Curated annotation (Swiss-Prot), chain A:
The protein, known as: Small ribosomal subunit protein eS4A
Annotated function: Component of the ribosome, a large ribonucleoprotein complex responsible for the synthesis of proteins in the cell. The small ribosomal subunit (SSU) binds messenger RNAs (mRNAs) and translates the encoded message by selecting cognate aminoacyl-transfer RNA (tRNA) molecules. The large subunit (LSU) contains the ribosomal catalytic site termed the peptidyl transferase center (PTC), which catalyzes the formation of peptide bonds, thereby polymerizing the amino acids delivered by tRNAs into a polypeptide chain.
Record location of the Glycyl lysine isopeptide (Lys-Gly) (interchain with G-Cter in ubiquitin) cross-link: K54, K126, K153, K160, K166, K171, K203, K225
InterPro entries the record matches: KOW, Rib_uL2_dom2, Ribosomal_eS4, Ribosomal_eS4_C, Ribosomal_eS4_central_region, Ribosomal_eS4_central_sf, Ribosomal_eS4_KOW, Ribosomal_eS4_N
Curated annotation (Swiss-Prot), chain B:
Other noteworthy facts: Present with 5130 molecules/cell in log phase SD medium.
WD repeats: 80-119, 124-163, 166-205, 223-261, 272-310, 317-357
GO BP annotations listed: endonucleolytic cleavage in 5'-ETS of tricistronic rRNA transcript (SSU-rRNA, 5.8S rRNA, LSU-rRNA); endonucleolytic cleavage in ITS1 to separate SSU-rRNA from 5.8S rRNA and LSU-rRNA from tricistronic rRNA transcript (SSU-rRNA, 5.8S rRNA, LSU-rRNA); endonucleolytic cleavage to generate mature 5'-end of SSU-rRNA from (SSU-rRNA, 5.8S rRNA, LSU-rRNA); maturation of SSU-rRNA
Gene Ontology molecular function terms on file: snoRNA binding; U3 snoRNA binding
Function description: Involved in nucleolar processing of pre-18S ribosomal RNA. Required for efficient pre-rRNA cleavage at sites A0, A1 and A2, and biosynthesis of 18S rRNA.
Residues of the full protein shown: 130 to 570 of 573
Protein name stated in the entry: Ribosomal RNA-processing protein 9
Source species of the chain: Saccharomyces cerevisiae (strain ATCC 204508 / S288c)
Superkingdom of the organism of origin: Eukaryota
Swiss-Prot record, chain C:
Protein task: Component of the ribosome, a large ribonucleoprotein complex responsible for the synthesis of proteins in the cell. The small ribosomal subunit (SSU) binds messenger RNAs (mRNAs) and translates the encoded message by selecting cognate aminoacyl-transfer RNA (tRNA) molecules. The large subunit (LSU) contains the ribosomal catalytic site termed the peptidyl transferase center (PTC), which catalyzes the formation of peptide bonds, thereby polymerizing the amino acids delivered by tRNAs into a polypeptide chain.
Species: Saccharomyces cerevisiae (strain ATCC 204508 / S288c) (Baker's yeast)
Lineage: Eukaryota, Fungi, Dikarya, Ascomycota, Saccharomycotina
Disulfide pattern: none
Record gene name: RPS24A
Protein name: Small ribosomal subunit protein eS24A
Coiled-coil annotated spans: none
Length: 237, 365, 101
RNA sequence: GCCGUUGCAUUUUAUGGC
RNA sequence: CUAAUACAUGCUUAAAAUCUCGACCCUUUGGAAGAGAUGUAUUUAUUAGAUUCAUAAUAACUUUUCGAAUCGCAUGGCCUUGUGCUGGCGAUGGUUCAUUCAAAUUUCUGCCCUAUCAACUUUCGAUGGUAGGAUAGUGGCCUACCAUGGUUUCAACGGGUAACGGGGAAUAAGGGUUCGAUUCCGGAGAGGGAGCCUGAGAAACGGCUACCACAUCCAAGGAAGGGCAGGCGCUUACCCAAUCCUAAUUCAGGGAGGUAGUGACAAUAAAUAACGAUACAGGGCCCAUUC
């Protein structure tokens, strides 16, 4: 990846180089994830060089969602738990009110799960069904109530399902793409749109409405009462 | 830090212990008292430093040690003062105490054996020392200089840090706290400036309110600001100044204009208002003490909202020109250096009770 | 030798690299462009580890003279200087051999 | 610490002049 | 002459093994005659799908494919000790799916002017359907049959803009200048031709064979490169320390990248002196060229 071709949510300025760290192939997309090299020296700033990254990578300080991933440019995406065992830090990757990834230091058991919207449900080999989440993870043997547009609280010590929340009106949403990235308000109503592009209307606790696609609507809980500690700013914008 | 010690009401003022000591010097310019047993240091225009012990609150300050220079030390690398010493300041470790005056040098002294441990040339014919102020719990010397400078030293290593420029007349008064900032006045430019040492910036507050507009006030219901004589820092967010016409100006760091100005304090006696010749606040408190040659130290209580201040009272035990105020505690012991004339060699008129010495006043609770 | 008075600010504990980063300030009245060697000596006596546990670089001086600001480093041990430092600075400090090719 | 004056009688305490 | 990282060979373990059920007995922390069943790739056919996809059996198919003779940290567990079972930590391949990176087909939107351009296309596919071939893939994409069709007046098509195309970068009327040879990509060509290859991704010419122009060497048999850049006409060196990419990959590399040469059409600051002192000496200077 080249510079002035890197996306805006990495917060990198026009000087200092010619190329950008291209996100590697992985469970997340290239456009809505932030690489590990961009995470530690450009957000947390505790390294200074690109060479200083690989020294930290080969000392096993870091692990993403319980797994180390000691590649330079691994695409850590949304709801990912980056864990610094040295100095005892835990992190959750969440967007700002402007669309950029935020640092939110989380607790020790809030770092023991994540929330995964399932993308698709099909009947696998030998009669067992399976769900496929948005973060490149598959879970076989699901609860048969779980279908598409449902988020799943994931165990993170095993690949098993601990909780699921169905896509309903009045359940705590979070925008994951588009112009309205980073807003909350649990649902106004739905539009069918036979032919795709399904519009879900959201009005916040500060009583203002907006329109996003069904692509971007990611529920995280019930009204009020979230299932993850939200940063300051509260997605109200 | 902000103002938190609220004890203006607790001060029993009317029965404060008042006493006075006559000393063997003419025209004592300053007094500086250490608190870690408590010490005291006095310099006069008779070329002398004198060390007192004031750890016993019921007693007058008894004599420990004293040192007087002479005309031997005419050159400027001599280890002694050969002219009037205008200010004195003790280091917060109790190990050194430095003097300087019209001999345009800076002589650091040992508190133990009273020996000249350092002499520093200011290297300017206009680099006269006027006020030395130490940062609280530090050794970074702030030196007001008559060539419109502020010179910053270190004590433990005896070096020079940096110099601030900017004023338009002679910097008389400078006050500091434990942070790295200080307030200065230029005393005829009719402004005061706040100095951030690492930021190397200044914030300039402006006096000079015309009494003509006050004559508008005289239609609604005085005297000229000509010389901002003293400045004192109450907290890191506000300060005060004392003028040549009885007005005492309260200042906020968010206010370009005076957030308060008190009208005539020590009074008059066409007519002549008294000069605000001394001004010293108790640190991080709401209480401050202003002094004149009128004969009574007037003490004032800052309001809780930092918007006005109110009279605590008057202490009439000290007749003569009050040059410098020191306040120590444990109870409270007030010391005041009373000289026969003003600090600057200035002329004084018809003073009742011409005497030289130290005022002491103990206030309980 | 004019009371060097090396001042340090911006101290942040960095235990994941086992170090403490801080901006070195070098006031030097009547003294010009002192060293890289004496600086590592005289800031290791406020942290009290060793000379070769101290890295330093940078230092574009003030215009005219009398002030110099660079960038300083201190580690927890000698072996950390052999792992966490760049390869040419250790040759510069003397702690390594530059295999020329 | 120059002088005067008062209570303890001067060390102690208070006041006037240079 | 002779090795393996070469070629051809075979258990899937204590008699296979593991699962369910069971006429009955007994209450249980249970036990039984007998009764059923089990890995897997390719092509076609049938049927279930109640609540042709998945899933399954069925009947055949293929050169009938696979089925752990593995690797390291340690020289590993266990008994009266058997050709024993395999392997404490985690490592590779193989079966199959999704994802990621992409790649390919596809929807809509989007530039000047022009009727002094009113009809365009068919024919040997233009339009539709049938069926077949072809490809990684649905599809007139291609071929045989049948029909005579499809677009268009708030405008199809024909035609000019010497700007190879836009997103974009500066002055900042948005009209405009410059670049579009663009910072990102798309079309062309590597002497000209046809055929052929590798890789998931090339139509590779900065891959191969052959044909054609075409020249260099010759010991006279034969062997060989593709007519190219660069400069004048108006002297070009060093280094992977940073960014990113690659790695037999914490080593190093990069005709990626970074660092010195070149100077009156212009133009930029200011140096070539500053301050004192005395004895001699005056017909010294200006205006009317005048008087």
């Amino acid at each position: 990846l080249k510079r002035l071709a890197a996306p805006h949510h990495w917060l990198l300025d026009k000087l200092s180089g010619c190329y950008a760290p291209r996100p590697s192939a992985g469970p997340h997309k290239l456009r809505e994830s932030l690489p590990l090299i961009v995470f530690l020296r450009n957000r947390l700033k505790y390294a200074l060089n690109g060479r200083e990254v690989k020294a930290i990578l080969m000392q096993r300080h870091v692990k993403v969602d319980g797994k180390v991933r000691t590649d330079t440019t691994y695409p850590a995406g949304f709801m990912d738990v980056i864990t610094l065992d040295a100095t005892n830090e835990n992190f959750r990757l969440v967007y700002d009110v402007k669309g950029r990834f935020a640092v939110h230091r989380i607790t020790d058991e809030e770092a023991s799960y994540k929330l995964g919207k399932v993308k698709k449900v099909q009947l696998g080999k030998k009669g067992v069904p399976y769900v496929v989440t948005h973060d490149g993870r598959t879970i076989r043997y699901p609860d048969p109530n779980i279908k598409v547009n449902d988020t799943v609280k994931i165990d993170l010590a095993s690949g098993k399902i601990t909780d699921f929340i169905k896509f309903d009106a009045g359940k705590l949403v979070y925008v994951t793409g588009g112009r309205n990235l980073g807003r909350i308000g649990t649902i106004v109503h739905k539009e069918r749109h036979d032919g795709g592009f399904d519009l879900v209307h959201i009005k916040d606790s500060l009583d203002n409405t907006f329109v996003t696609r069904l692509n971007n609507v990611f529920v995280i809980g019930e009204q009020g009462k979230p299932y993850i500690s939200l940063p300051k700013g509260k997605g109200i914008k | 830090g902000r103002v938190f010690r609220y004890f203006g009401d607790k001060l029993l003022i009317s029965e404060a212990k008042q006493s006075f000591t006559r000393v063997g010097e003419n025209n004592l310019t300053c007094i500086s008292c250490f608190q870690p047993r408590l010490f005291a240091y006095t310099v006069s225009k008779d070329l002398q430093l004198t060390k007192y012990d004031i750890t016993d609150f019921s007693k007058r300050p008894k004599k420990l040690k004293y040192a007087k220079g002479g005309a031997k030390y005419i050159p400027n690398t001599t280890e002694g003062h050969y002219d009037e010493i205008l200010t004195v300041a003790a280091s917060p470790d109790g190990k050194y105490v430095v003097t300087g005056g019209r001999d345009r040098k800076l002589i650091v002294w040992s508190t133990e054996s009273l020996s000249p441990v350092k002499v520093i040339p200011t290297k300017d014919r206009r680099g006269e020392v006027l006020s030395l102020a130490f940062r609280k719990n530090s050794d970074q010397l702030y030196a007001s200089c008559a060539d419109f400078k502020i010179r910053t030293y270190s004590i433990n290593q005896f070096s020079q840090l940096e110099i601030l420029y900017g004023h338009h007349d002679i910097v008389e008064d400078i006050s500091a706290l434990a942070m790295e900032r200080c307030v200065t006045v230029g005393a005829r430019d009719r402004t005061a400036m706040l100095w951030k040492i690492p930021d190397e910036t200044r914030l300039t507050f402006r006096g000079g309110d015309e009494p003509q507009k006050l004559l508008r006030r005289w239609m609604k219901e005085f005297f000229c600001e000509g010389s901002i004589d003293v400045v004192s820092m109450v907290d890191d967010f506000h300060f005060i100044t004392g003028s040549d016409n009885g007005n005492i100006c309260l200042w906020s760091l968010a206010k370009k204009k005076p957030i308060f100005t008190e009208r005539i304090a020590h009074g008059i006696l066409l007519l002549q208002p008294f000069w605000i010749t001394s001004l010293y606040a108790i640190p991080y408190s709401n209480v401050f003490i202003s002094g004149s040659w009128s004969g009574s130290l007037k003490v004032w209580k800052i309001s809780d909202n930092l918007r006005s201040f109110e009279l605590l009272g008057e202490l009439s035990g000290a007749k003569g020109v009050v040059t410098k105020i020191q306040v120590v505690e444990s109870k409270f012991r007030i010391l005041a250096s009373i000289a026969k004339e003003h600090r600057l060699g200035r002329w004084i008129a018809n003073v009742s009770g011409a005497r030289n010495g130290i005022y002491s006043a103990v206030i309980d609770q | 030798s004019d009371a060097v008075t090396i001042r340090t600010r911006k101290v942040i504990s960095n235990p994941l690299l086992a170090r403490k980063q801080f901006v070195v300030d070098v006031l030097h009245p009547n003294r010009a462009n002192v060293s890289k060697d004496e600086l590592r000596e005289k800031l290791a006596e406020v942290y009290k580890a060793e000379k070769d546990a101290v890295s330093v670089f940078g230092f574009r001086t003030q215009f005219g003279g009398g002030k110099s600001v660079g960038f300083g480093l201190v580690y927890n041990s000698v072996a950390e200087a052999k792992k966490f430092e760049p390869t040419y600075r250790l040759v510069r400090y003397g702690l390594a051999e530059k295999v020329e090719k």
